[PDB]
Amino acid sequence: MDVVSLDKPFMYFEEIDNELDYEPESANEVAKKLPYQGQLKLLLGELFFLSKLQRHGILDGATVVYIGSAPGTHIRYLRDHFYNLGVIIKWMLIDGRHHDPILNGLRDVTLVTRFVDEEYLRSIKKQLHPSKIILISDVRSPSTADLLSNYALQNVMISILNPVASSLKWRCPFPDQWIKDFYIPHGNKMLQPFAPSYSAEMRLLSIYTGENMRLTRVTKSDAVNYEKKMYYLNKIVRNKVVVNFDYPNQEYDYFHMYFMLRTVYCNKTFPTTKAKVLFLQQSIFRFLNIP
Amino acid sequence: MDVVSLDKPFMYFEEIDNELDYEPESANEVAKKLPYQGQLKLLLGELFFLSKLQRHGILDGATVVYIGSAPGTHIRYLRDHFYNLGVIIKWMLIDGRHHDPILNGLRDVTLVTRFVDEEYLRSIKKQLHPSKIILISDVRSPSTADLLSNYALQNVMISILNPVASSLKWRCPFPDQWIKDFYIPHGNKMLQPFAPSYSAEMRLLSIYTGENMRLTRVTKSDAVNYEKKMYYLNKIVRNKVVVNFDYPNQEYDYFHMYFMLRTVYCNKTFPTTKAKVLFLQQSIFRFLNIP
Ligand SMILES: Nc1ncnc2c1ncn2[C@@H]1O[C@H](CSCC[C@H](N)C(=O)O)[C@@H](O)[C@H]1O
Ligand SMILES: Nc1ncnc2c1ncn2[C@@H]1O[C@H](CSCC[C@H](N)C(=O)O)[C@@H](O)[C@H]1O
Ligand SMILES: C[n+]1cnc(N)c2nc[nH]c21
Numbered sequence: 121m122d123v124v125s126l127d128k129p130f131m132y133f134e135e136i137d138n139e140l141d142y143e144p145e146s147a148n149e150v151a152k153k154l155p156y157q158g159q160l161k162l163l164l165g166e167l168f169f170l171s172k173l174q175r176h177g178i179l180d181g182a183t184v185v186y187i188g189s190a191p192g193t194h195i196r197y198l199r200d201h202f203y204n205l206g207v208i209i210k211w212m213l214i215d216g217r218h219h220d221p222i223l224n225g226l227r228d229v230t231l232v233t234r235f236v237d238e239e240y241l242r243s244i245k246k247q248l249h250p251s252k253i254i255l256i257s258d259v260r261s262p263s264t265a266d267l268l269s270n271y272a273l274q275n276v277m278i279s280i281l282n283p284v285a286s287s288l289k290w291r292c293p294f295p296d297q298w299i300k301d302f303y304i305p306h307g308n309k310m311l312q313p314f315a316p317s318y319s320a321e322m323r324l325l326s327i328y329t330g331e332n333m334r335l336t337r338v339t340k341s342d343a344v345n346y347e348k349k350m351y352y353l354n355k356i357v358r359n360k361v362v363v364n365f366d367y368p369n370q371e372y373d374y375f376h377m378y379f380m381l382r383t384v385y386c387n388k389t390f391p392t393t394k395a396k397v398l399f400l401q402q403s404i405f406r407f408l409n410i411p
Numbered sequence: 412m413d414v415v416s417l418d419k420p421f422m423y424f425e426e427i428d429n430e431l432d433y434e435p436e437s438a439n440e441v442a443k444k445l446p447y448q449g450q451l452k453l454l455l456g457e458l459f460f461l462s463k464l465q466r467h468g469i470l471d472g473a474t475v476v477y478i479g480s481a482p483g484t485h486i487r488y489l490r491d492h493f494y495n496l497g498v499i500i501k502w503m504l505i506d507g508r509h510h511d512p513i514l515n516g517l518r519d520v521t522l523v524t525r526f527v528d529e530e531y532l533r534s535i536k537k538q539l540h541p542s543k544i545i546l547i548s549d550v551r552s553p554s555t556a557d558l559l560s561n562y563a564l565q566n567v568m569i570s571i572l573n574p575v576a577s578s579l580k581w582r583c584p585f586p587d588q589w590i591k592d593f594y595i596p597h598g599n600k601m602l603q604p605f606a607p608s609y610s611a612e613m614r615l616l617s618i619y620t621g622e623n624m625r626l627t628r629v630t631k632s633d634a635v636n637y638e639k640k641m642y643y644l645n646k647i648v649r650n651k652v653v654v655n656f657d658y659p660n661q662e663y664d665y666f667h668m669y670f671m672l673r674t675v676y677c678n679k680t681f682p683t684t685k686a687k688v689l690f691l692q693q694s695i696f697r698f699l700n701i702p
């Protein structure tokens with residue numbers, strides 16, 4: 121067994137303290153071990169992101185605009201969690217595909233069937249006005265050309281929507297398929313528990329202060345760095361069984377999940393963090409139908 | 412006579428401490444009082460900007476890429492000034508129109524006859540590599556649509572060229588002709604002595620640290636502010652005769668010129684700032700053929 125003892129898990133990209141040459145043979149390995157793992161991945165990251173905003177007092181009274189929301193099964197759990205905590209949020213889910221019907225019938229959530237373009241963003245900005253906007257993007261066209269297009273749209277989402285905070289899908293193009301340098305919004309590179317086995321995708325979390333927008337250039341050398349750090353994280357780290365982690369499951373991804381879940385707010389009071397986390401995890405797994 | 416006593420002149424937009432409702436009748440008033448005033452305006456601002464970079468030690472060894480450089484008569488004085496100071500700079504002047512022939516025959520200055528587009532910027536970036544770039548933009552298409560187009564090109568100049576510093580033409584569209592909000596690079600809003608009588612144009616001076624690019628949104632309310640502050644500056648301030656300014660010319664624009672010129676470096680040593688400024692001014696006026 122691949123056992124180890126860790127203090128904490130890598131929560132952000134910059135914390136990864138080692139690298140590995142990417143082995144293309146890893147692409148043939150099992151990418152997922154849990155049913156509905158994709159919904160789990162998104163639910164944990166978005167709970168984490170939204171709990172942070174609550175902590176900064178910018179969540180209550182906002183309209184969350186989620187683009188690339190369908191099917192969005194896990195979004196029902198999110199909505200329920202904050203609704204039950206008494207936070208007042210309006211949800212606007214926009215995607216050209218259809219949403220899971222469990223999202224229907226809620227006055228606080230509006231489902232829109234439309235693929236957004238710059239023009240449409242403008243009309244929704246005019247219509248949402250003057251509410252504060254929290255943007256969540258999970259759009260997917262992929263080729264490096266596809267990604268760049270996606271990233272360009274995401275930056276236009278921020279410039280037109282002018283949100284108070286954003287969570288953007290972020291996966292750096294592979295160095296061997298570079299096309300050109302580009303800019304992405306400055307934010308924290310949140311790592312994701314339960315991401316596919318060899319995924320290099322993370323989540324860019326930004327909070328907008330003032331009327332300023334800070335971007336950061338991404339170069340091929342950066343792409344080489346993303347590749348090696350994420351490959352090290354995926355091949356070595358995530359395959360560890362944290363033995364000093366006294367929890368029903370000691371696999372790295374659960375150890376990492378624990379640290380995200382400990383930051384979530386609850387109504388029920390618990391005697392220990394461990395109790396709250398186990399509660400939240402059980403709750404999450406039952407909702408998503410994960411044994 | 413409209414006399415007053417001032418400590419210093421307004422050097423940047425944020426220093427303007429008052430405003431006035433714009434009177435459209437001002438547009439019918441004499442816009443210029445000096446021959447070649449347009450060349451004078453650009454020469455002073457660019458001397459100011461470049462002297463600052465020298466002060467930060469980022470000028471020597473750089474290639475200055477000036478887009479919208481023609482005719483560019485005044486650029487010859489600039490080139491001569493730093494060349495004679497021993498600073499090593501390569502100049503690349505690009506414009507679809509033709510440059511003043513006084514710019515020909517210098518190995519350190521390359522004249523290009525081309526209207527730049529995004530694609531061309533890419534090729535010049537590849538060709539200038541690996542030299543450090545200082546960007547100067549003075550492109551002119553105007554309608555608010557024209558301006559926006561200009562500003563969008565200027566931001567693409569920075570993203571593709573990735574300069575160490577930039578000086579960009581900046582005039583906010585009029586509030587009564589607003590189209591949409593937009594972003595401009597963060598920088599200092601340098602005011603310009605000898606600008607047309609009622610011009611609201613200034614120069615955006617930015618220095619790029621790290622791999623970050625900071626932008627700032629400009630809204631119609633901002634446009635209203637630019638209009639009133641610049642109108643106050645133009646109608647009231649610039650029409651003052653600074654009597655406590657012991658100089659051959661006490662008109663505000665000369666008082667303002669003095670403060671820009673005092674920051675310029677010379678070979679000759681002077682006993683007082685006043686002597687250096689008078690020297691630089693005389694030199695400048697003679698070159699441009701201004702009595
Ligand atoms: N311009 C655009 N506007 C809206 N949705 C877009 C888009 N381009 C792609 N998409 C959507 O991006 C989605 C990626 S999969 C999204 C999964 C979803 N976040 C979940 O919680 O289940 C696709 O459904 C696709 O239709
Ligand atoms: N894409 C583009 N590339 C280069 N020059 C451009 C341009 N669009 C407009 N211009 C140029 O912008 C200029 C504005 S007037 C420039 C004056 C010059 N800076 C001086 O020192 O004399 C015009 O000459 C115009 O041809
Ligand atoms: C799927 N995949 C393809 N090509 C790469 N270079 C790569 N690196 C990580 N994952 C990868």
Ligand SMILES: C[n+]1cnc(N)c2nc[nH]c21
Binds near residue numbers: 433
């Ligand atoms: C030339 N011009 C036209 N319209 C305006 N609104 C304006 N403000 C300053 N100058 C102006």
